[PDB]
Amino acid sequence: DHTEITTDSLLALLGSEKVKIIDVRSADAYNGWRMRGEVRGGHIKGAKSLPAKWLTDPEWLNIVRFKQIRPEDAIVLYGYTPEECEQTATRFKENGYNNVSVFHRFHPDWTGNDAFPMDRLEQYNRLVPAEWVNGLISGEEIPEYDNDTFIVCHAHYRNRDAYLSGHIPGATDMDTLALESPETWNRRTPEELKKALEEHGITASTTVVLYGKFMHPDNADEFPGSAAGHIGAIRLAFIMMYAGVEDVRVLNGGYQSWTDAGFAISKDDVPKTTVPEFGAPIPSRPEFAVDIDEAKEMLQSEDSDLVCVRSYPEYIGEVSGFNYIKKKGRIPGAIFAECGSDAYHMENYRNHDHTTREYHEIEDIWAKSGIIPKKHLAFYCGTGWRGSEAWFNALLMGWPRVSVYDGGWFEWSNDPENPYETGVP
Numbered sequence: 062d063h064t065e066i067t068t069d070s071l072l073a074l075l076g077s078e079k080v081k082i083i084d085v086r087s088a089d090a091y092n093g094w095r096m097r098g099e100v101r102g103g104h105i106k107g108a109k110s111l112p113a114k115w116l117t118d119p120e121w122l123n124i125v126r127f128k129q130i131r132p133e134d135a136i137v138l139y140g141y142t143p144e145e146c147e148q149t150a151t152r153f154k155e156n157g158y159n160n161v162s163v164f165h166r167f168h169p170d171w172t173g174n175d176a177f178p179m180d181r182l183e184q185y186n187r188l189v190p191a192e193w194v195n196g197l198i199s200g201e202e203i204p205e206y207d208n209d210t211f212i213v214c215h216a217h218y219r220n221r222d223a224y225l226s227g228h229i230p231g232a233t234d235m236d237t238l239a240l241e242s243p244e245t246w247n248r249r250t251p252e253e254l255k256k257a258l259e260e261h262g263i264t265a266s267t268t269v270v271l272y273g274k275f276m277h278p279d280n281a282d283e284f285p286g287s288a289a290g291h292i293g294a295i296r297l298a299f300i301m302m303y304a305g306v307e308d309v310r311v312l313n314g315g316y317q318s319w320t321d322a323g324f325a326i327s328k329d330d331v332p333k334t335t336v337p338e339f340g341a342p343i344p345s346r347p348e349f350a351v352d353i354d355e356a357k358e359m360l361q362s363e364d365s366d367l368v369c370v371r372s373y374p375e376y377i378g379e380v381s382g383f384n385y386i387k388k389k390g391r392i393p394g395a396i397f398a399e400c401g402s403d404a405y406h407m408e409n410y411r412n413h414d415h416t417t418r419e420y421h422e423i424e425d426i427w428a429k430s431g432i433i434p435k436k437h438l439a440f441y442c443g444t445g446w447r448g449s450e451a452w453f454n455a456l457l458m459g460w461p462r463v464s465v466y467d468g469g470w471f472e473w474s475n476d477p478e479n480p481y482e483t484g485v486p
């Protein structure tokens with residue numbers, strides 16, 4: 062039936078390839094959130110992330126095999142309690158994984174003893190869990206927060222129904238058109254950004270928690286981006302951090318994470334409180350956004366490289382990805398980092414619950430193509446949405462020189478004098 066591994070045995074196996082240490086806690090605890098008040102947040106060094114809440118996913122066995130977890134591997138599960146990994150161990154044993162052990166002493170033994178190595182997402186407090194947002198709006202004391210004023214922002218693209226059909230209590234909505242211009246789909250000018258943030262009640266010293274709602278985008282609609290709300294949320298996070306909002310948060314997973322926790326929702330139309338001054342020059346961090354001239358300079362630079370976060374059909378020129386762009390092709394010289402199925406999904410950068418994919422798997426995929434934190438990188442896609450999320454992931458890992466090429470394929474292909482390749486490489 063069972064098998065236990067002690068702290069002594071597990072420590073002498075952290076480098077072994079045939080053992081797979083599996084963290085069954087939440088992805089937010091995996092990244093470094095001290096969800097139980099532990100003195101050290103994060104995961105055991107070398108652990109893979111497989112939250113036990115995914116056991117209800119009928120694709121659980123495919124998620125396991127997409128993580129290269131093979132039946133001949135020595136499975137080592139752990140969590141906050143050994144009872145957390147019991148239903149996952151049985152789930153493995155019935156599917157042919159006969160070598161399955163459970164590590165009992167991750168908390169407080171492994172966490173409360175510095176001799177045991179742990180790892181965490183370097184900027185994890187920017188990727189907040191649902192419990193953190195609940196305590197924030199409830200006035201309760203929470204870690205990783207020490208501010209007076211905050212604003213929860215529900216993001217969407219010309220679809221206020223996404224906000225009115227159910228949102229977080231006290232939350233105000235923000236159309237993506239408040240921060241990006243429809244003529245270029247780039248960030249707005251500083252004066253427009255200053256005026257837009259003030260009429261939403263955002264100052265430079267205001268903590269902004271951003272999130273969106275996944276509403277199953279279909280490529281047959283007029284505005285599929287009106288259903289990819291959480292992508293626009295991270296897209297708005299990049300713009301605010303570019304503008305100068307010093308403390309910007311993102312609810313990991315979006316509206317799905319709020320309802321999964323079981324918290325109350327509101328359907329009210331909360332009015333916007335206005336603030337008279339933003340209080341900081343815009344943009345305060347202009348290095349986060351590059352334009353077309355510097356993007357062309359980064360292609361020929363040995364120190365730089367562009368990252369194409371688009372789908373494979375767009376990359377080979379089969380489709381343009383959008384119903385308002387007609388030219389198909391790819392920018393020559395960029396490194397391909399596939400986002401997923403189409404222009405409104407991020408399968409390769411997300412779990413099924415829309416939380417950010419295990420960042421180690423993101424680093425390993427990026428590393429195989431030469432995408433490393435030593436370079437100055439500018440992520441881009443069609444118009445900057447999918448590139449903003451890829452940039453946010455690299456920002457969360459503490460990469461020192463990452464940016465977004467706002468123009469993307471939209472601005473690039475609009476100039477006939479700009480080159481582009483097509484077809485399979």
Ligand SMILES: */[SH]=c1/[nH]cc(C[C@@H](C(=O)O)[N+](C)(C)C)[nH]1
Nearest residue numbers: 246286404442443444445446447
């Ligand atoms: S990178 C690309 N993927 C989605 C979006 C949003 C886009 C759309 O809805 O097509 N705009 C909101 C119009 C910019 N950008």
Ligand SMILES: [Br-]
Nearest residue numbers: 289290291292
């Ligand atoms: Br989304």
Ligand SMILES: [Cl-]
Nearest residue numbers: 369391392470
């Ligand atoms: Cl491209």
Ligand SMILES: [Mg+2]
Nearest residue numbers: 246247444467
């Ligand atoms: Mg743009």
